Amino acid sequence: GSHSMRYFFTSVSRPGRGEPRFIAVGYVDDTQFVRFDSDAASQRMEPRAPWIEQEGPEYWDQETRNVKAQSQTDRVDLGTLRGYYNQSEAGSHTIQIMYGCDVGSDGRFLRGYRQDAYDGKDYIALNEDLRSWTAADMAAQITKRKWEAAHEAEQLRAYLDGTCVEWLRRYLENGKETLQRTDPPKTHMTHHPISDHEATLRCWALGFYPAEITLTWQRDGEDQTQDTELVETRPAGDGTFQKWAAVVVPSGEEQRYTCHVQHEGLPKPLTLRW
Amino acid sequence: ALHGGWTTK
Amino acid sequence: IQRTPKIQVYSRHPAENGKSNFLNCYVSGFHPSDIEVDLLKNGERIEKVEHSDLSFSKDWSFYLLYYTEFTPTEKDEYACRVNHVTLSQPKIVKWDRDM
């Protein structure tokens, strides 16, 4: 199916405690493959997947230089945005950045993106046409005018729909064997009395990849998203994911409830009953 | 591979 | 402005006493990024605990996975202890095999 390459950046100011903490991570689909931590001993971009380690020292040289320049740009922007928002130099603040590209199974460019945040809220984002910007408030409009004048969208577009796709295609080929394929979810159900008259029915899905999945509970056709407890999808730590959903039912009426599972490795939507 | 371009905010 | 973490403590593979497994504490949905996460065995902090690299979701909230190899014994109690600015007292979530 489709694939993605995404880079995530976080810069957190440390007032009076040194330079800002900077952490950068690269993903292909849901698989991390590179990392950089300003507080780590290497001070280099590091491999985190087997198929990226075959890259030569000139690759790691360029990636280390480019990730450090991103950290130095964020240092400037932390001070600049503190001024835009009229904040003191004493508080800690966060800049987060995400950009990347998606390709189809044929390798064709589908979409590129770039989004920036300040203190966990939207700041500025590139539009899907890769030609215009959307600022979230009047402070971020200052950045937009500066980027519109410098024609930043043109150089960024050349990367997002050009170089980004180029490297993603190469990574998909270099890691074709061990890149996590669509692993179907293993499903089962459990039953947990909470009293003499009620019980918790929990619907499980384990060891699946990718992370996208849908779990729903029906009671005689009708839906019960209100009385359903749904946990966030969670990593198993081996490359696969897990998720469960639970409903409290009256003892004796368990047969009136059905769980429904949807994944990309499922030919048809699985349906379970206790 | 990362983007090698930086415009400050 | 500040969002409190959601905590899930769980094992990678179905728990079976005597068999080596992996104890996970997945913390997500929090902001700001500074957080303290300790895994506990019978109330005491496991010393060799690894964690993933900081990342975030579409809503910009952060998530982290702390993990360590453990050999579950039915008498041993395991828990995850998390401290965040949104918390007054550190939150302790005990490991339950049915969740």
Numbering used by the authors:
A (entry chain A): 1 to 274
B (entry chain C): 1 to 9
C (entry chain B): 1 to 99
Sentences from the paper on this structure:
We thus designed an experiment to directly probe the importance of the pTrp6 flip in the neoantigen. The tryptophan analog 3-benzothienyl-L-alanine (Bta) is isomorphic with tryptophan but replaces the indole nitrogen with a sulfur atom incapable of serving as a hydrogen bond donor. At the same time, removing the hydrogen bond donor by substituting pTrp6 with Bta should have little to no impact on the TCR-free peptide conformation, as in the neoantigen/HLA-A3 structure, the side chain at position 6 remains accessible to solvent. We next determined the crystallographic structure of HLA-A3 presenting the Bta-substituted peptide. The structure showed there were no significant changes in peptide conformation, with the Bta6 side chain aligned against the HLA-A3 α1 helix and the sulfur atom solvent exposed, mimicking the conformation of the neoantigen. Using SPR we could not detect binding of TCR4 or TCR3 to the complex of HLA-A3 with the Bta-substituted neoantigen, although this complex was readily recognized by the s3-4 scTv positive control.
We recently described a panel of TCRs that recognize a public neoantigen resulting from a hotspot mutation in the phosphoinositide 3-kinase p110α catalytic subunit (PI3Kα, encoded by the gene PIK3CA) that is presented by HLA-A*03:01 (HLA-A3). We show that TCR discrimination between the PI3Kα neoantigen and WT peptide results from dynamic allostery, in particular how the identity of the position 2 anchor influences motions within the peptide/HLA-A3 complex that in turn either block (for the WT peptide) or facilitate (for the neoantigen) a dramatic peptide conformational change that is required for TCR binding.
